[PDB]
Amino acid sequence: QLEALIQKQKKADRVFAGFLLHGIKISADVHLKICIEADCQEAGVIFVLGGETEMPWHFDRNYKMDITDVLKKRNIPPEALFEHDSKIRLEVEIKSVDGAVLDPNSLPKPSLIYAPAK
Amino acid sequence: RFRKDISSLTTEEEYELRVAMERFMSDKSINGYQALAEFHGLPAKCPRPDALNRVACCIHGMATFPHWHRLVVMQFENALFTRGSPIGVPYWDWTKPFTALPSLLADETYVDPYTKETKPNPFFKAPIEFLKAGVHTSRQIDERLFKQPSKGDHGFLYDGLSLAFEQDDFCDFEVQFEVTHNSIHAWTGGSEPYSMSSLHYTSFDPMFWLHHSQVDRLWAIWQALQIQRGKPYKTYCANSEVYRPMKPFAFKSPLNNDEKTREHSVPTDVYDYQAELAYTYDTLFFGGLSIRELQRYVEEAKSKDRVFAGFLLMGIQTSANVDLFVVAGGNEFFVGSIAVLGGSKEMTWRFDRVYKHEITDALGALGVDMFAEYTLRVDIKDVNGTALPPTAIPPPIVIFVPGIADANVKFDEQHRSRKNVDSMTVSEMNALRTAMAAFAADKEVTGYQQVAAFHGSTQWCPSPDAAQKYACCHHGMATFPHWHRLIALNFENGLRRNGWSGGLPYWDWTRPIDALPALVLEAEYTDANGEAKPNPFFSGAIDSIGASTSRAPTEALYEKPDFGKYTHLANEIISALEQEDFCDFEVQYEIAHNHIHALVGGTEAVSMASLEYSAFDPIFMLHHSNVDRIWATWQALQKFRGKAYNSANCAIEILRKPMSPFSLASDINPDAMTREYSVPFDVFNYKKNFHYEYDTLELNGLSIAQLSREINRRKAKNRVAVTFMLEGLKKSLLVE
Amino acid sequence: NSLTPSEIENLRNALAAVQADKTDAGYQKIASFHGMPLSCQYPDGTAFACCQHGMVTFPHWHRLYMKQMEDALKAKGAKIGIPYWDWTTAFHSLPILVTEPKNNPFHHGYIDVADTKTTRDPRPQSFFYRQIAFALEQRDFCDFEIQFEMGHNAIHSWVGGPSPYGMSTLHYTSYDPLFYVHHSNTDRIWAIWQALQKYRGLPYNSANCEINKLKKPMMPFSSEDNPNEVTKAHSTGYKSFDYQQLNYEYDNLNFHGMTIPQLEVHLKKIQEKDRVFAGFLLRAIGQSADVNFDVTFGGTFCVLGGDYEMPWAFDRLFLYDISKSLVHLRLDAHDDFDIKVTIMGIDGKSLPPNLLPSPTILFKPG
């Protein structure tokens, strides 16, 4: 049944936000906002673990998080992601552990990933 | 199957067909070499080997001449393939100015790389087996004369074929086609009874097929001209003659053993050579001109009042050279020489039309008008001449053709063709050098420094305010291919604006290199008059901000490969071409491109070793023209692989955002297209939007189709890979 | 496939839209025509099912029928045509639109006449590829149809299975959204053929066999009670050949990976090798059943049919290549063989015997 629901999902057109992550020598929480008209919505969130004493790490690839349903709420069709005429942009408010503080953006910007169905 | 230029062949390709030819030739059977060399002429197998009256089989002086020889060339091709050559029968341009025969068929011997033994070159000689004397083919005597005197404005062979491509009707094209081709036969043959002077034994000499691979390609060129011209390309002028079964090929299983050629012994379906015969050519470029470029030249040609000397050429048994003289007063003038190819047992032949020979510039240099009183003198000399009476051939007549066309304007006002700087003519070289000076001469916005300055620290990112600065050249590197697509376009367009009719050339570094192209290495060059150094393709270029010349000192390499494997760059690009989605390609794509930047970029920081100063050396234009070419090869591969080519689905963030420096209109850059097509999504489709096509998309001798097989053959291997996670550092670093 | 959201997105709503017009049909009237509720009358006015399969004018009726259906999404954001799925291309599973359980208009239909939504029971190189390609091979239209209809209904057999309310049955098939979509494809196949002919200079917007029958008008499309002007206009046979005045377009008439010209080469290429076929006579029977071949397995093919359907008999034989079978037994069309068959009803039983007579067995070089 698990693989049944999984195969089901790959049969839908999906949109992701790609995050290259690495040790910033401190833990932090990464909030994702995609802004259409400079109107912003809380789309999703990422957490990062780390410490003063840390083993420096860089991910081999980027973690994905699907904005697929979030886009459906804003009624901006997946097709408009390709259109320069239509206005959409991606923004992240990186916020540290102690609060706020907040970190100036030390994490590379997210990318839109369109995964067409099979 | 790919038929290439003889010069374009790598030593691998050169050796592999040498062994194939060697095997095909060495050992004699009905499926062997001799049996095929005997198809064309003199064992006299037509109409039948039986009985009393027999003449040479090959068709000449008829509209089916090219059809016939297309089959023979195909026979030779299949025979070589079957014996282990990956390549179709190669061709050599005689249209290219040449002093002597190419090394492939010139050398008596060659060294075997594996055995390290020097054995006979199969293409220099060839035995003649049906006689019992032997050997005895000998192309050794070359007639008068290779570079001059014959015609020419210029190149004997080039002019005649230009005129041939000009004609609308098939037969009109065919006469000029064949009789021009006839010359190089008699020219290379000489006084020798064998080896291409005589119709009888011409096909025994191995040059014959390399020769007619070219001839065939020329027809293919004319055919593509006609579809662009929008007119019928089949042989309707001689419709009945297409249904006559090609004489030696149509024969039954003992006499001819090739399936493909026997099915097509009726040439009606021979026209579509790619479908029916399963081969093609590396380029259909004639001279330096593309096919669209080719129709232009004949228009400039067809706009003049021209006068011709027309010859009706019918079969006289011997093969003969006639020298044409224009005599308008007292002494006469040599206007040229044409050759008629034949033999004692030749199949009786006669042209329906007349062969037109240009004689237009004979008149001018004689101080004589078109309509002044003049005779034509011919002296007919046999190749074994023993010169012939002038009556052997019916007297020439002069034909007058008034200027004609208004086919302008033309949709290729925007169209360009990018070729190799290693392949350029001295005439084309000077044309590029002068054009670039004016490009360099302009120091502000419409000039060369500005487009080079987009690699500079000038701050357009962000704006109007930007609080802290960095260079605005696109890297990162997802959109790297797109931006340089536009940079190389700006470099091109600005260079076109300054008196040039061509597109921005490139150089193949996938292939091995001895030194930089002739266009770049030298500080000083000689114009037609003779000139001091402009240059302006030496690294010398003033950066207004830095106030210096961007000097480029070479490095210790670059020539590593042995017989077995490709150059390191070729290996890299293959791995880059492998990838399915765009980004996985892009990473490999450019990391490979970073090489030369660091290779011609020596110790000196003013060189293109640094991406800040990089673009001020003009080789950058050549580099990222070729870099852009690879990106285009890929796009064709993606189409071949049935996957997205003029779009992509990764890194949409940067792919939908207009470039920083190109999107800042209108004060900052003059280009209409880079302004309109600044979004990476728009710059994907280079064919429709930027109106330029490349020379070839072939990579290191491998066509796109072969490339995919090679890409697939490698993927069958069980292989390990080491991966590198790369971040941007200010230094320009070599990492081993 | 190749759809881009929201291209998918617009449609469900449209299909949703007509689920009840429900006045014109709104959709149930549009459903009845292939479906169970009685379309027409013999002059005695007895119930007939106005289904126009089993005859040579088979495509027009449907190809239209899509139209009627197709029009029905009219200006309801019927922004593109009914899609087609190329069942020819081998497929591990069914296609989404008609799978997604939740909030999907393609899952099922309802039936006022039965109080139920449709039920479907799917049952287990590509078989259909081989089967369709043959149809394309043919040049006579009539010759083509027999294979074209039989290749077709093979899917109404397998999509539906053993539910009366389903695609396997004539009665309620038309009710399931899956049915049109299968069609676009069937129609597309026909179109490809036309392009083929045209390529070959044979008639494509015409057809010489039989002159009889293309002229008979088609109900319901005939009927006064069809409040779409267009279909009535082409209610005829001979009109409806040129689908151009419909007016629709398929994205591309290319069979998978083939130019039409490419396609003929293919077929021409296939044609080299001499083949061996079996041809059956098939004729009306009330039930719908599948038939399984034997000599090793030679099977198989299916026939579509229901109670109160107009009876029909094909003019020509239906051919099914069995050469792979012979190689399987190593026979040479020379050694002589018994062609054994079986014929199951769609309901669980019961493989009753012919019914169909005997299969002829014929050889084609080569």
Ligand SMILES: *[C@@H]1O[C@H](CO)[C@@H](O[C@@H]2O[C@H](CO)[C@@H](O)[C@H](O)[C@H]2NC(C)=O)[C@H](O)[C@H]1NC(C)=O
């Ligand atoms: C070289 O050419 C001359 C000129 O034709 C040849 O002489 C002719 O030969 C044919 C037979 O092949 C005779 O029928 C003609 O009457 C000859 N004409 C003349 C003017 O000689 C001559 O045979 C050739 N020489 C060689 C060595 O082949």
Ligand code: CUO
């Ligand atoms: O043509 Cu037969 O000789 Cu080159």
Ligand code: CUO
């Ligand atoms: O261009 Cu930015 O460097 Cu190759």
